[PDB]
Design a protein around this nucleic acid. Sequence first.
RNA 1: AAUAAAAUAUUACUUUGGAUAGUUUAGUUUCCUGGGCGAUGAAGAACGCAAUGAAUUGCGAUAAGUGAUAGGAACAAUAAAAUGUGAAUAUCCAAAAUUUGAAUGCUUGAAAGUAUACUAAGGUAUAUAUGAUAUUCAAUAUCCA
RNA 2: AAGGUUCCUAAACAACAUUACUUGGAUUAGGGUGAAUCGAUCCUAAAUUACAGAUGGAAAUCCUUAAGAAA
RNA 3: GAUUCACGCAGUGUUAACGUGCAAAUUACUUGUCAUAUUUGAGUAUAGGGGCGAAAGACUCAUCGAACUAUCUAGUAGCUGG
RNA 4: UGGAAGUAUAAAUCGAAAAGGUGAUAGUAUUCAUCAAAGUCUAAAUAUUACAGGAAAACUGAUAGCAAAGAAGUACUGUGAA
RNA 5: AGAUUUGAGUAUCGUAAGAGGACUCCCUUAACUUAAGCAUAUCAAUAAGGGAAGGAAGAAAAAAUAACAAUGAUUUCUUAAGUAAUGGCGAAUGAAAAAGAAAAAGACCAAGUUGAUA
Lengths: 72, 50, 92, 122, 102
Amino acid sequence: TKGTSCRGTRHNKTHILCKRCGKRSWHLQKQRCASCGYPDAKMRQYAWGYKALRRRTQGTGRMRHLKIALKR
Amino acid sequence: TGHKGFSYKLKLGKKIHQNRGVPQWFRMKTGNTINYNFKRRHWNRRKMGM
Amino acid sequence: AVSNIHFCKDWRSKVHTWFKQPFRKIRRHQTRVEKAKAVFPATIKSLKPSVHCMNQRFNYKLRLGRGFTLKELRAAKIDKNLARTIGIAVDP
Amino acid sequence: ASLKISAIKAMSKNDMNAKLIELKGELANLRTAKVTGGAPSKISRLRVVKKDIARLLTVMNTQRMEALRKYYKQAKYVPKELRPKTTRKERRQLTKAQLNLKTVKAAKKAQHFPARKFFVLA
Amino acid sequence: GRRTLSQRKGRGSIFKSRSHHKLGVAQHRAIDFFERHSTVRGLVKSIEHDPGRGAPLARVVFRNPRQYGLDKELFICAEGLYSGQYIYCGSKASLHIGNVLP
RNA sequence: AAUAAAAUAUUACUUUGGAUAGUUUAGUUUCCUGGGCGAUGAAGAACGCAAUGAAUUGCGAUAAGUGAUAGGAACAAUAAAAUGUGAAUAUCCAAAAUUUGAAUGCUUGAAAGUAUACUAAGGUAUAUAUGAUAUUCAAUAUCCA
RNA sequence: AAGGUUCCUAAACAACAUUACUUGGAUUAGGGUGAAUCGAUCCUAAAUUACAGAUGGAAAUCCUUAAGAAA
RNA sequence: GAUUCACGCAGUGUUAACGUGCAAAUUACUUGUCAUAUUUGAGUAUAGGGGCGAAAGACUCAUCGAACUAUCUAGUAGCUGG
RNA sequence: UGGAAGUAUAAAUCGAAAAGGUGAUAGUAUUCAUCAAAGUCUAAAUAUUACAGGAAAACUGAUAGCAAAGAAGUACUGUGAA
RNA sequence: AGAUUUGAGUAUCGUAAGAGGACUCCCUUAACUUAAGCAUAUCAAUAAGGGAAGGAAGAAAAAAUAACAAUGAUUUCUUAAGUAAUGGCGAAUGAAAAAGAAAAAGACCAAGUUGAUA
């Protein structure tokens, strides 16, 4: 019963959306985000996660105020 | 659920709003390749993970 | 022949290529030219002594040194404070 | 967009808000007209009026801020929104006057033994 | 090998004391002047069952000697104490069952 | 012994598939110039805004855009209106810049919220550490009438 | 709880529900969710996390009222 | 922490069905059990030479005599295939 | 560490000076040579595969070249890192 | 009562944080691999983990070399050189002076002195 039957009771969320990164990686019982490293001030980045760095970093968003400054 | 937070309901409403197709007039523009929205999903076809 | 190659460490990140060499020539030359334009005897490469080389292997060859001693300035009757301002190197 | 800047600039401070209140009320009925199946000419009028409000607000804010700058021109304590445009780094750098400060011993030497101009005969 | 169950007991994860319905800390009242140079009289209001221990606990109520009010203690019942009994604590207390003496 | 339905063989034409050929508004590498973010609120995230838009793009309650300076007659899928009394377009400029976020009055889960002061609503300020100045204090800590 | 518009109506059936479909939890387009009294908001339970303090080379760990001119 | 039946639960036997299945462990009858060492929801605690175990090396997201994931890493192969 | 009777750093103990360090084989002595530690700043020549803006190529030509020549870190998968 | 020392609260004017980390300066005692096994060694200032900066950073003005017909801050390049040395002296690791160039630049504290002292 480790296969099909045991999947029926899965109706309790472990992660929900995080306030800082918008992903569903906020652990409800650990009170921290698995992806962006919430309340920790620094963003969670690792050298072994090089793809994770090229997915969310500088230049992946709007750059509302930095696009004018560097252009200036 | 029946009970939901305020912000969570608005992110549910936006998912409803984005499940629409290309309007006909947009398809008649010159040099147009966008015919169907490939970001479409249905409640019984794919769960949106939120 | 017993080979001696120290390639067992990561040599690929130790490789330095000289592709900037033809452009270093232009860069340095343009600064040498610009220096003379600014104040011409600044690139005059202030005068330097004729010192011998070290060791018995080289001691019979003269070569440019760095700055004249304060005894050489007195012998030639030059103020050591004025020497540095008329393109003379000084090495106390 | 039919309001004309010259028409706006000639208006008084109270006439700005008198026009602004009327402009907002005009757009409120135009949003209703769009809902109630109004004519396309009313929809085009709806697009126009949105620009007059934006055009009107730009003049009132620019004139207000320009007057504020003149008020704080001689002020010792200037609000941060009126200070010269600089990056965070620039406001921390030492000023050029402070970068070039010389001790009195070194200041008098550079005036008594300056770099002379010369050349060597060949 | 693994860590034996004796090692896992020192972590205190599922081996924490199940102290939720416990009454409190059973101890004498704090030492002061009236317990060192006089006597205080306490009234045994009730005798109760403290979960996780075999002896009953007595709810003794002393008056506050320095302020106005009460001072509620929690003693371990000596065999023989009854509700409404008076017990005396201090250096001058009599040698009766339930009295606290140096 | 016999037939050629099936089976097999070749060519032409059609079909399924997308190889080959022609092509490139995409990449790779080297070199040159810089290496110009943030409490004056950054990078990132969310939400919203087009006459008809779902994505994307641009923007922020002044919304696919406002003012100013250049610019000179367009846009287009379909209508409208405005337009040489200045349309598109560009900008190291000006105004404006929602919720968050180092996030900083307090709380925050997907939480709706909320206290005081200053200037019913609206807007500012109030985190921690910290330098200088002013000011109110604490300690018989050292003297001392 | 979980799902998230699957609810209702109209038009319409190319694809989908091992035949077919005028049917549909499927396609298109509109409509729909009203609270002083129901709940969240309030309180604390197991447990959880801050300023200062203590520890550590470091990241950070410990402490939850004990160490504090704090609460 | 008596005997049984029932709502439920388990999984003794058929070593039945099925075994490119209804199902990556299910179905039918039979059997056992069916409230105090009971059954069960939500919250909360315990994490990889670690946890948890009425103890089978069992369980720790279909993964366990050491989980999953990424990096060192194109690990090494006197062996196998081209 | 190439530094081999200890080249450098740190910890425990110890701890100088009418100065002294070094001359890489430990030790004592006398000469010689050369410096004068235990505070601070300092342009120029050098590096660069972040990122931005350019120029080039005996580079690839849609199974190639970046993972991405279209709304590409997008569609889709996982509780999650990924 | 007064003169001080120390420590706080409040007000004003500022400062730190977060992003990036290709290059720069450091902390930390990885292992696969090689040695035809393996245990020191090698991989190796290498990977991952941690901190801090700039357009460059680091270093920099001899308690330095040398033993000469002597040199002379720092940095970088050529050569010395796979050399001296290190190593189950096995596998392997491995500099620097001299010499040739690019560029060149030196200055301050403390200690000492002057005290109708500022």
